[PDB]
Amino acid sequence: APDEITTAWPVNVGPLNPHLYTPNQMFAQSMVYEPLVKYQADGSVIPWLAKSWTHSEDGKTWTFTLRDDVKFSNGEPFDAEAAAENFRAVLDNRQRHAWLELANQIVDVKALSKTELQITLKSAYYPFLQELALPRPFRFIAPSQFKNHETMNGIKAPIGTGPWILQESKLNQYDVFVRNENYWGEKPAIKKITFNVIPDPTTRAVAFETGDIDLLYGNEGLLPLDTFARFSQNPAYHTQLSQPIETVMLALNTAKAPTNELAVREALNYAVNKKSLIDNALYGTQQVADTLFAPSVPYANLGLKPSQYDPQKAKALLEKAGWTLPAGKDIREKNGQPLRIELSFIGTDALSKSMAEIIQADMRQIGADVSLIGEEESSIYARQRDGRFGMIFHRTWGAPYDPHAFLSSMRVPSHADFQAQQGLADKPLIDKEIGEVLATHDETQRQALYRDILTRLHDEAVYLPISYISMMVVSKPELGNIPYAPIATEIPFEQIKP
Ligand SMILES: O=C(O)CN(CCN(CC(=O)O)CC(=O)O)CC(=O)O
Ligand SMILES: [Fe+3]
């Protein structure tokens, strides 16, 4: 069947509530649900469910003109009432969306007619349109499928306007999607997509080698990277590696001994041989990261000075800070206290473990004792939210989140970044400036504020950037060239064209 494919995902796609997070998978929410405006790789948006829009001079009131020809997959019309009901349903759960500042800025949403939708904002929020473009939460389910006139407590059928329809889901086995034959836009070439639930990366590679699946698409965790490199040379297969999409880093706890000392954080940022780490654990497949955001990220080409691998310098910094080696020991001490740092990661994630072992080795060579704390996912996320870590693996979010949304979220205390930053004298100023940068319409001031925030974060050595990672593809050749989505968390199945 040349227009049916089988792929894999580590978990089910979830219930496909458009307005909720885990266990809903973003790429799948994006398959069914659509936005008012669609994000493009150049950073702009184009008309989508909204054909056009205007705003007020003060930038607080926006009026969208909607398409008039869009139906939900169940035949019900998409109109301004439906869109307004969705916004209400999202904002009824406002607390859950704190990380996204548009959810705090929207003050009112109302359908002025079937085709006119008015959105009012607290302030002149510059990332407005890009945040409407996101996979979640501002996309649209048929209001008939609300439960008790809400979505925050669940939905009935996951009815969107999008090019794919969920056919069926079987927990821990598979999810099947079919093409929407009444889609308002271009019809996908592919008719059916089956997602086999395959949690282990090795098991995913095996499934591809046996012919059980036709396509694997995902980030650096998709399959073992040595196997990837092998497949890349195998003439029976097709593989791809995108340009980098986001940063993988450690976050260092500025509020916990001994990472509360700037000098210790500086030393750590000279201690890791990142090129080696990438060649060893990532099989040469990713790029070295010197800064939180790659220089290609909007607002982030700042000429920030890299801390290159330099164990001599790391040891000098620590000696100067009073962290010195006792007679016959390899671990430094200050005030009888050992230089001991806990590194938390997801313990069943083989790649993270491999990286953690490398980081531990490199840091031992400069007299820091890194203890590896590998735990289940829920325990790691809990550590991130409450700052119970020394160092922790973390990542940025990709386009169109990076940098404005990721920075916005640094203000939210129940996220790793806030927690890592909590010990900085200038954290309140950073948070103030993050608030300002998002509202400011003076473009000169906006660049200054991004420079200031990112520069403080860099100079304070809050992070240990490791790698700018890429999306990876393995496919049967008959599927052809597999496109990448502008939005880093989306999978553009509708663009596959054998
Ligand atoms: O996952 C969440 O609950 C919310 N996200 C907000 C950022 N997300 C977008 C999302 O979940 O909608 C980025 C991402 O998950 O890549 C927090 C996080 O991932 O750290
Ligand atoms: Fe998220």
List keywords for this structure.
monomer; 498 residues; alpha+beta; D-Maltodextrin-Binding Protein, domain 2; Dipeptide-binding Protein, domain 3; 2 domains; 4-stranded mixed beta sheet; 15 helices; binds the ligand O=C(O)CN(CCN(CC(=O)O)CC(=O)O)CC(=O)O; binds fe (iii) ion; transition metal ion binding; metal cluster binding
**Total strands:** 21
Percent of sequence in beta strands = 15-25%
Distance between the termini: 12 Å
- The biggest beta sheet, please? 7 strands, mixed
Q: What global shape is seen?
A: globular
CATH superfamily of the largest domain: Periplasmic binding protein-like II
Structural class: alpha+beta
- Rounded Rg: 24 Å
PDB class: metal binding protein
Keywords: chlorine insertion, chlorhydrins, bio-inspired chemistry, metal binding protein
Assembly: monomeric
Entry title: Crystal structure of the periplasmic nickel-binding protein NikA from Escherichia coli in complex with Ru(bpza)(CO)2Cl
Write the layout of secondary structure elements.
Elements: E1 4-9, H1 26-32, E2 37-39, E3 45-47, E4 50-55, E5 61-66, H2 80-91, H3 101-105, E6 106-111, E7 116-121, H4 128-132, E8 146-147, E9 150-155, E10 164-170, E11 174-179, E12 192-197, H5 201-210, E13 215-218, H6 225-232, E14 238-252, H7 262-271, H8 274-281, E15 287-288, H9 311-320, E16 333-334, E17 337-338, E18 340-346, H10 350-365, E19 369-375, H11 377-386, E20 391-395, H12 404-409, H13 416-421, H14 427-439, H15 443-459, E21 463-475
Parallel strand pairs: 1-12, 18-19, 18-20
Antiparallel strand pairs: 2-3, 4-5, 5-7, 6-7, 8-9, 10-11, 11-12, 13-21, 14-20, 14-21, 15-21, 16-17
The protein binds the ligand O=C(O)CN(CCN(CC(=O)O)CC(=O)O)CC(=O)O and fe (iii) ion.
